[PDB]
Every structure is written in structure tokens, then in C-alpha cells.
């Protein structure tokens, strides 16, 4: 549930990490990893 | 109030039911519970778990009241009584949504238990003859309980020493107070000793410690409640005195009163003199020259066990001691374990009791060991009046479970569903076993339906080989007569909780 009330139900790793609220400085860079997996691979995100 | 109050009373039992799930079975785990006595209880059997459990909701005390009834009755595996009674209340949630009254539920479970009393007699068989008997049958029944809780690997050495202690019990007497033992801290976990008599720790120290002889060949036992110390008289010590020399005579009289009684202790000549009250340092250096065993601060329970062993008595007057008040035993050997000396009474005139000396620093280990001895006397009592047993592992209830489904199928309409829920509630015993063993409850319970129908009767569930086999032929057995009062007690308690629609709390 986002700040505006958007409900998204999925197992996609890139979608979950996109709206995930992370208070850890290094763990925020893990979202960039999922962003590169969608641009380069873009398939089987749940397995990757 | 209403249907919601009954669910609130059931939910109070669910917290106890969910905590007792690991507490059943050999492969069941343990739960940690802290009490107000600063005693951390880690145990398998739920016998002492329900006593030390903190009760929050008032309705949860119903399972505690029925636990003490089955505590002195069975004591081993009684945690399944509240689990089965909890399943009867848990499976009653869809029944509360319907218009079925609790009294219609009362008649449903009663007809299943009334037949179950007859089935247990039919499912079992008289053994007797040249088959398993004393020194054999007692070892098979005691090994099931004990090895299913603690000392899993070393149970071969540990249980064998405890079974040999119960062998001293004989028929025609069968006293129930013979299970009294003591707790010995310290030592190795795999080391244990056998003692046929009362053992009591020093608990105090005095200058004549190292001078106390530990070995008496033919001691004489004497019990006295007289405390040895300089203290005021019983009521009033006020003495009117005129002359000055009489005040030193009072000091002499206070000494002569004690010193004359000190000579009367050594005048008897009994090599064992026990004081019910503490012993001070005033009589130490005197009585030490006589070189007779002495122990102070002895508990009143240990003094009563000596009276019931050698037939002694406690007297406050030495001149009134009768010739039979001095008891004798076969041998007296004082053992010292961890700088703590222990007296030993061997060869009492009549002793059927065996006090097991344990070792180790963990206090929670003896909880089930004392409970195992409480179950050991139950095995002896239930092997005499009626001779029969059933299979072990907990699969006995699954044999009668399907027998209730077959009979009640054709019996009076709606009463089929209520009894079928009882037979469904009997499946929780193997269900909690398959959960803690990492097995598959679906495949096993489906095979039991054929194992309890086309598989005749005695085939049980084997945890060691992860297969289904006969526990009766395996020689591992479980007491049959303990399930009669266990199944009937849970029904009257469940019918009482479901009949309470409101709870009143003053203040």
C-alpha cells in the first residue's frame, strides 16, 4: 500500500522493491539492482 | 454472553492447547516456562506443566482442576486429555453456529465414551501365562514412557537402572507411598546410583566434619526430637534466688540439665542418632568424642519415612525409650558426592521403597524422573488387578476411532455427525506426532484407515524406521488401563465448558 493508496499484489521483485520503503542506506542501492535486471534481462524476475 | 462467551472460554483453552502440542510423543519437543519460584521448567510430559502454568482467563482453570485428578490417577501422557478435550471444543465452533445445544453434544460424546470403555477391553488381550511378566513386562512398559522424554541416547543405561529399582515392589502390599525419593544436585548426567533407603544431605557444617566416620557395620537407629543447644526453658525461666552462690548454681543447673541429657544420648549406644531439630555447636565437641553418626535439621517427611521403614519412633524422653525403638539395618555407608555427604540405610526390616540417587546440575531433569517413578507404580498397580496391555506409540486411539465411525454411521441420524467429530477429534494424537516428526500426516492417516480395518488391529506407527508396523510385536507397549479414565474425564469437562454461556467477575 503506497502513500496514495495504490494496491499492487504481485511476486515481481522489481515491482516490490520499487515501492518498498527502506530506511537502510546500503539497502536502498538494492533497488538499482532490480532496475538493471529489468533493463538487461527483463524476464524471469522472480527467479533472478 | 451468548455464543460469543463460549468461544471466549474455548479460546482460553486454545492458548493452553497450542502450548501442549509439542508435549505429546517421543519425538515431541519441549516448551520453556518460567514460574514465580525462579525454576525454569523444560519438560516433555504435560503432567507438571499444567500445575506451573500461569492461568489468565478464569475458565482456563477447568483444565487445571481435571489435570490434578488425572495426575494421581495416570500422570503419564495426561497432556493428551486436555488436547483431546480442546479438540472437542475447537471442533464445536461449527456446532455453535448451528442450533445444536450443548446437551445434544453431551449425549453425542458420552455414547462414544460409553462404548470406548467396552472397546478397550475388547481391543486388549490377557497376556499372563509364560509371556512378558515381571523383570520383562515391567521393563517394556517403563521404557516407553521414560525413553520418550529425556536421556534419549543413554536410556539403555538410564532406564535399566530405574526398572531394576521398581523390581523390589511385590504384590499383596503395593503401598502407594513407596515412590518417595530425593533430589541430588551435581555430578555427571549419565551417572546414577541405586539406594534402597532414605538419603539425606548434611546441609550444615561443623568442626567435627572430617572426624565423622562414614562406615558402620551394624549401626543402631534412634530418632529423637530433642534440640541440643543452650536456650531458655519452655514457659518461664524466672527463678527467685536469695544467696549469691546459688546464681553460679543456676549456671551449673543450666549446664547440668543439658550435660545430663548429653550423657543420656551416649548412654543408649545407638550408632545412628538423628535430631528432628537443628543441632548447635555446644554438643558438637562432646558428642564427637563418642564417634556416632548424627544429622540435624532433618525434614519431617524424611523422619516419617524412617518410622515407616525400620519401625522406629520419635520420643522426647530418653528414659522412656522402649527396646523396639532402636532399629537395626544391614549396612550403613555414608557417600560423599561433590563435598556433600549422604547417609544410606541398607537392609531395613521392611523396605519396599527404592530412593534413586540422581546426578547433574539441572533441576528440571528430576521432574520427569519423579514422574516416571509415579508412572512406574501405576504400571505395577494396573498389571495386577487386571492383566492386559495395548500397543505403544499412541496409535491405540486410532483403532477405536474407526470402530466408532462404523457403528455410529447407522445410528439415529444427526448423532452420526457429532460422533464423527469425536472420531475426527481422536486423530489429533497422530496429527501432532506427524507434525513434530517431520512426516506427512495425509499419507499416514490414509494408510491407517486400511491399517485399522484390513490391517486387523495391533499395527501401530513406528517413529524409528519412518514406517508403519506392529508395536505389539516390537515389544514396546503402552498401559491400556490408563486410557479408560483419561477419555471419560475429558468428556465431562468439555460438556461443562460448553454449557457456560456467561462469566461473572466481581470487583
Amino acid at each position: 500500500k503506497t502513500s496514495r493508496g495504490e494496491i499492487i499484489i504481485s511476486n515481481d521483485g522489481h515491482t516490490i522493491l520499487k515501492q518498498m520503503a527502506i530506511l537502510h542506506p546500503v539497502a536502498r542501492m538494492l533497488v538499482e539492482v532490480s532496475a538493471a535486471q529489468d533493463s538487461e534481462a527483463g524476464d524471469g524476475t522472480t527467479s533472478v | 454472553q451468548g455464543k460469543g462467551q463460549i468461544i471466549s472460554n474455548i479460546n482460553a483453552c486454545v492458548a493452553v492447547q497450542e502450548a501442549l502440542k509439542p508435549t505429546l510423543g517421543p519425538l515431541g519437543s519441549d516448551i520453556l516456562i518460567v514460574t514465580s519460584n525462579q525454576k525454569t521448567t523444560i519438560s516433555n510430559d504435560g503432567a507438571t506443566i499444567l500445575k506451573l502454568l500461569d492461568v489468565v482467563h478464569p475458565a482456563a482453570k477447568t483444565l487445571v482442576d481435571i489435570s490434578r485428578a488425572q495426575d494421581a490417577e495416570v500422570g503419564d501422557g495426561t497432556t493428551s486429555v486436555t488436547i483431546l478435550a480442546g479438540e472437542l471444543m475447537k471442533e464445536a465452533k461449527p456446532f455453535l453456529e448451528e442450533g445444536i445445544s450443548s446437551h445434544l453434544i453431551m449425549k453425542g460424546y458420552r455414547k462414544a465414551v460409553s462404548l470406548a470403555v467396552e472397546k478397550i477391553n475388547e481391543l486388549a488381550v490377557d497376556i499372563t501365562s509364560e509371556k512378558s511378566s515381571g523383570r520383562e513386562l515391567l521393563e517394556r512398559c517403563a521404557r516407553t514412557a521414560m525413553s520418550s522424554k529425556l536421556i534419549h541416547n543413554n536410556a539403555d543405561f538410564f532406564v535399566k537402572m530405574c526398572v531394576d529399582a521398581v523390581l523390589s515392589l511385590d504384590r499383596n502390599d503395593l503401598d502407594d507411598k513407596l515412590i518417595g525419593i530425593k533430589k541430588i544436585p551435581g555430578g555427571a548426567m549419565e551417572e546414577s546410583l541405586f539406594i534402597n533407603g532414605v538419603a539425606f544431605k548434611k546441609t550444615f557444617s561443623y568442626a567435627g566434619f572430617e572426624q565423622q566416620p562414614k562406615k558402620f557395620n551394624n549401626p543402631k537407629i534412634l530418632s529423637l526430637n530433642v534440640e541440643l543447644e543452650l536456650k531458655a526453658e519452655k514457659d518461664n525461666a524466672e527463678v527467685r534466688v536469695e544467696h549469691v552462690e546459688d546464681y553460679q548454681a543456676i549456671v551449673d543447673a543450666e549446664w547440668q540439665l543439658i550435660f545430663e541429657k548429653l550423657r543420656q544420648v551416649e548412654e543408649t549406644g545407638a550408632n545412628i542418632v538423628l535430631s528432628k531439630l537443628p543441632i548447635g555447636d555446644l554438643a558438637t565437641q562432646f558428642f564427637a568424642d563418642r564417634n556416632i553418626f548424627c544429622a540435624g535439621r532433618v525434614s519431617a517427611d524424611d523422619m516419617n519415612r524412617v518410622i515407616q521403614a525400620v519401625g522406629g519412633s520419635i520420643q522426647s524422653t530418653t528414659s522412656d525409650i522402649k527396646p523396639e525403638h532402636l532399629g537395626t539395618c544391614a549396612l550403613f555407608e555414608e557417600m560423599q558426592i561433590g563435598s556433600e555427604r549422604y547417609n544410606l540405610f541398607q537392609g531395613c526390616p521392611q523396605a519396599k521403597t527404592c530412593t534413586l540417587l540422581l546426578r547433574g546440575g539441572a533441576e528440571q531433569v528430576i521432574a520427569e524422573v519423579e514422574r516416571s517413578l509415579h508412572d512406574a507404580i501405576m504400571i505395577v498397580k494396573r498389571a495386577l488387578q487386571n492383566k492386559l496391555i495395548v500397543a505403544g506409540g499412541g496409535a491405540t486411539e486410532m483403532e477405536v476411532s474407526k470402530c466408532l465411525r462404523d457403528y455410529s454411521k447407522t445410528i439415529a441420524g444427526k448423532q452420526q455427525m457429532i460422533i464423527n467429530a469425536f472420531a475426527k477429534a481422536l486423530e489429533v494424537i497422530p496429527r501432532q506426532l506427524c507434525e513434530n516428526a517431520g512426516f506427512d500426516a495425509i499419507e499416514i492417516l490414509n494408510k491407517l484407515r486400511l491399517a485399522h480395518s484390513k490391517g486387523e488391529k495391533w499395527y501401530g506407527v513406528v517413529f524409528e524406521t519412518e514406517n508403519i508396523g506392529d508395536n505389539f510385536a516390537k515389544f514396546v507397549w503402552e498401559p491400556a488401563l490408563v486410557k479408560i479414565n483419561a477419555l471419560n474425564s475429558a468428556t465431562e469437562a468439555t460438556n461443562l465448558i460448553l454449557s457456560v454461556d456467561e462469566t461473572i467477575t466481581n470487583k
Binding site: - | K61, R240, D252, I314, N485, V500, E502
Partner: protein
């Protein structure tokens, strides 16, 4: 509208609670007192005892219920629901404009009328006096008010208890009053219903003195009850020991031993089988007591000694002397048998004579369920009292069938009393309609099915045939709940005439007291 009305809402909370606690299909409750006392029972009488009373009419109901426990005590919630139903009907009568005086007159004139209608429902006129067999059959339906699970086992425990206390003396023996306090039930944790036994003597839980009670197999003994407890000799006021010299210092302890030699040997000279000691004694008493084989009762209570005088049959000696051969009790066997894991000292005899004040050992798994059985024994012996002290209590049709015929009788009385009595009497029969609806509500049946069954039996008419089926048929639910009719003669479910006779006077008294209250006055409370 703020006093005579709102006062009903205070009882309405307790009235709804009594609807589910009445009948064999009723519901139990959990009670937690302010001091920590826990009570679980289906009877609302004990509930109102420990519950804090705020509204004044609540104390009126518990005192009226206490009057039933002194007399009857069987189905006390019947009149409580009837009294609570009058308050629900009162809201209908007050809305009509009837004054509080005329409403009481409607209930008062119907009270004397209802007492006269109790003679028309009389059945089972004759009853045996000293016959136990017929008594065991009529006491069985009395248990149906409480838990009906086993009525046979509870009757067998009463059978062995009455057989001892019963004076017998067939024909006319000048039979005295049967003592209720003589029979005393003791709750024992553990065991099934069949494990319970009956002790002809006094069942005590304590430790035996020397070893265990024995030697009484040859019988022929003498037991004397001592009212004065045996203790260390002392004066009334607190004294101080004053020694004139040092020689008396060593003789003080020896002087007390001389008293033990004098007192314990003098009381043991006659060889009493069982001595009654209400206080503590020293350890030196075992010298003379174990020598002569005397059994010792250690620290009993106050109420257990009054019942012991009728067991051993010994004269209550006011002072403690040497046992007098003139006044002595006759006791044969005294043994100690282990039951629930501890040695239980019992005074039970074997034949040889029949004394009074027996006891019953009650063994059960659930201690909470034993409270209802303990109250069932009190109501069980109360059923015998109605057939004992009075000439007879006879019988009346139970299961609410008696109140059904009264509805037609009260209806006919309303047609003959015009004026304000028309609204009072016709609604007075409505107060009797809650009794059959209470049994049907606890059973879960639909009222729509029960209503024509209640109208069929006693309301329609009585045919000219002798002993019509309407009188011997009633509302009972086993398998017949679909039909709604059952014969009460085969099941033999009956109630005594004294049950409803005392309830009608309470129903009017409870209505007269509450409905006459103009306002509630409380000063610093």
C-alpha cells in the same frame, strides 16, 4: 416512569440469566467473587448469594429463595422466573393504567385461588413410610432438576446411606424426625461415578497415629466421645513459672513428665478403642496409647464432633476424667483404607447394629461438577423430608404439566370476576406460560411447534373416560421432541405438592413488595 418502571430493568438483567439456568437443559455459569471464590453451577440461588446486591429488589429475591432452601430447595428458579415474569407483565398492566394496589389484589386473590387448585392436580396420594424401594424410585426424578447424567448411581449412594440411618421400625414405631445434617457428602478428587462408596461411620482425611487403625476385627470395644479437649494442663489465666531455688529447675521438666504419666495412663486405663482429642498433645502420649492400642482422633473441627455423637453413640462427657463404665458407646470395627492415594480413616461398621449419621464418599474427575452433585445430595434428602415430617407430600405432574391446567383454571376465574380483575387475572395466567416456554427454550425447540402441543393436552377439554391421557402426558424431550408429547407416568417424573405450595406465596410476596415501591431511598450508600 422512573422508579416503578426502571426497577424492572434491574431485575430484567437477572431474569434473563435465570431463563437459561432453569431445567435439565439449562446452562451453567462461571462466578468470580471479589475475595477470589470461584463457583460454577447451574443454580441461580448460589449465584445471588455471593453476588453484590445493589438494587433493593435483588435482596428481596435472594431472601425469598433462601426460604425455599430451608423448606424445599428443589427448582428455586421456577418461582424466580415466575416472579420475574410478573415484572414483565407489570409493564403491560402499568401501561393499561391499573393502580399498584389493584394489581396486588389481582395476584393476592389468585394466590388463595391457586392454593385451592393444587388439590385438583393431586396424584399419587398414598406413599410408604419405611419402605426404601419405593423411596428410591420417587427420588430419581428429583435429580432431573439438576444434571440428569446418571440418576441410578446417585440413588445407590443414597440407598446405602439411608439404610444405615433409617430407624426402620415397621408399622407404628413412633418414628422421630429424620435428620438432614446427619447425611454429609465429602468431595474426593478423582475416580468415576461407580468408584464412589458409602461409609456408615464418619469418613475423615488425616494421618493415623501409631501406624494404622487395626485390631478392631474382633469387635467388642468401647468408645467414649470427649467434649473437653486433651491439652497441656494449665489454668484459665496466663501464668508464669516461678522457681524458689535451683533444685526445682531440674524438677520442672520432670514435673511435666509426671503429669504425662498420671494423665495419659488414667485415661488409658479403661482401654478406649477411639479417643476424641480436640486439642494437641505431646509426643510422650504414644507410650501409653500404643501400649493399650488406643486410636487417636487428632484435631477435628467443631461441626464434625456434633455428628460423631450419633455415630459412636457415646455420652458427651462435659469434663475429661477417667472413662466411666456407666456411660459408654458401642463401636465394633474401626479401620483405615486407602482410596484416592492417601490413607482414609473411616468409622464404617459391618452389620451388627444400625446407627445414625452416615457419610458418603463422592469421587469424581471434575471438582466443579462435584459442586452440583453436592447440591443434589442436599436437594435429594430434602425430597425425603417432604415424605417424612409431614403426613405426606403426595405428588403432582411435573415437567410444567401442572401449570398448563392452571392456565385454563385461571382463565375461567377471570371471566367470573369483571372490572379491573379482568386485566389482572387474564394476564396472571400468562405468567404461567413462561414455565413451558422456558423448558422449550433451553431444549432448542421452536415455540411454534410447542404452542399447539401446550394447547392440546390440558386446554381443550377432559373427556369422560377414567384417568384421561392428558393428565398422564407431558412435555419431555428425548427422541420425541418432534411430536412434543411424552407420557410422564412411564418415566415417573413427578413433583411434590409442597414444591408449588410454597412457591405461590413467594410469587405474590415478590410482586407485592416490588410493585408497591414508589421510590428508592439510600443515605450514604
Amino acid at each position: 416512569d422512573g422508579q416503578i418502571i426502571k426497577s424492572i430493568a434491574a431485575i430484567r438483567e437477572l431474569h434473563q440469566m435465570c431463563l437459561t439456568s432453569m431445567g435439565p437443559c439449562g446452562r451453567n455459569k462461571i462466578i468470580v467473587n471479589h475475595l477470589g471464590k470461584i463457583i460454577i453451577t447451574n443454580d441461580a440461588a448460589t449465584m445471588l448469594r455471593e453476588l453484590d446486591i445493589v438494587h433493593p429488589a435483588v435482596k428481596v429475591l435472594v431472601m425469598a429463595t433462601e426460604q425455599q432452601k430451608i423448606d424445599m430447595g428443589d427448582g428455586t428458579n421456577l418461582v424466580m422466573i415466575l416472579a420475574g415474569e410478573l415484572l414483565n407483565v407489570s409493564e403491560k398492566l402499568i401501561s393499561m393504567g391499573l393502580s399498584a394496589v389493584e394489581i396486588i389484589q389481582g395476584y393476592n386473590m389468585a394466590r388463595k385461588f391457586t392454593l385451592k387448585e393444587l388439590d385438583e392436580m393431586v396424584v399419587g396420594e398414598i406413599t410408604d413410610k419405611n419402605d426404601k424401594n419405593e423411596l428410591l424410585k420417587m427420588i430419581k426424578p428429583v435429580i432431573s432438576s439438576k444434571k440428569y447424567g446418571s440418576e441410578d448411581i446417585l440413588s445407590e449412594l443414597v440407598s446405602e446411606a439411608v439404610s444405615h440411618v433409617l430407624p426402620v421400625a415397621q408399622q407404628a414405631g413412633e418414628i422421630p424426625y429424620f435428620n438432614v445434617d446427619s447425611i454429609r457428602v465429602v468431595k474426593i478428587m478423582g475416580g468415576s461415578l461407580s468408584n464412589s462408596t458409602v461409609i456408615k461411620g464418619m469418613v475423615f482425611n488425616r494421618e493415623p497415629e501409631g501406624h494404622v487403625k487395626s485390631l478392631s476385627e474382633d469387635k467388642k470395644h468401647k468408645v467414649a466421645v470427649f467434649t473437653c479437649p486433651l491439652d497441656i494442663a494449665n489454668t484459665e489465666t496466663k501464668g508464669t513459672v516461678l522457681l524458689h531455688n535451683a533444685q526445682e529447675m531440674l524438677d520442672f521438666s520432670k514435673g511435666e513428665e509426671k503429669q504425662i504419666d498420671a494423665m495419659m495412663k488414667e485415661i488409658a486405663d479403661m482401654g478406649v478403642e477411639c479417643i476424641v482429642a480436640g486439642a494437641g498433645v505431646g509426643e510422650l502420649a504414644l507410650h501409653y496409647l500404643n501400649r493399650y492400642g488406643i486410636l487417636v482422633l487428632k484435631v477435628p473441627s467443631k461441626f464434625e464432633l456434633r455428628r460423631l455423637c450419633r455415630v459412636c453413640g457415646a455420652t458427651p462427657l462435659p469434663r475429661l476424667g477417667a472413662p466411666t463404665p456407666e456411660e459408654l458407646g458401642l463401636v465394633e470395627t474401626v479401620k483405615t483404607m486407602e482410596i484416592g492415594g492417601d490413607r482414609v480413616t473411616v468409622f464404617k461398621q459391618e452389620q451388627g447394629e444400625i446407627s445414625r449419621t452416615s457419610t458418603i464418599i463422592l469421587r469424581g474427575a471434575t471438582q466443579n461438577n462435584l459442586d452440583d452433585i453436592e447440591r443434589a445430595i442436599d436437594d435429594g434428602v430434602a425430597a425425603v423430608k417432604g415424605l417424612m415430617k409431614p403426613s405426606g407430600g403426595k405428588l403432582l405432574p411435573g415437567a410444567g404439566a401442572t401449570e398448563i391446567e392452571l392456565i385454563s383454571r385461571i382463565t375461567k376465574y377471570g371471566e367470573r370476576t369483571p372490572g379491573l380483575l379482568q386485566l389482572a387475572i387474564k394476564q396472571f395466567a400468562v405468567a404461567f406460560e413462561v414455565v413451558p416456554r422456558t423448558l422449550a427454550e433451553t431444549a432448542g425447540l421452536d415455540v411454534n411447534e410447542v404452542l399447539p402441543n401446550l394447547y392440546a393436552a390440558h386446554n381443550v377439554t377432559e373427556p369422560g373416560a377414567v384417568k384421561t391421557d392428558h393428565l398422564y402426558k407431558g412435555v419431555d424431550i428425548d427422541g420425541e421432541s418432534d411430536e412434543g408429547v411424552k407420557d410422564i407416568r412411564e418415566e415417573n417424573i413427578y413433583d411434590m405438592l409442597a414444591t408449588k405450595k410454597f412457591a405461590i406465596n413467594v410469587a405474590t410476596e415478590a410482586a407485592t413488595t416490588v410493585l408497591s415501591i414508589d421510590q428508592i431511598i439510600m443515605a450514604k450508600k
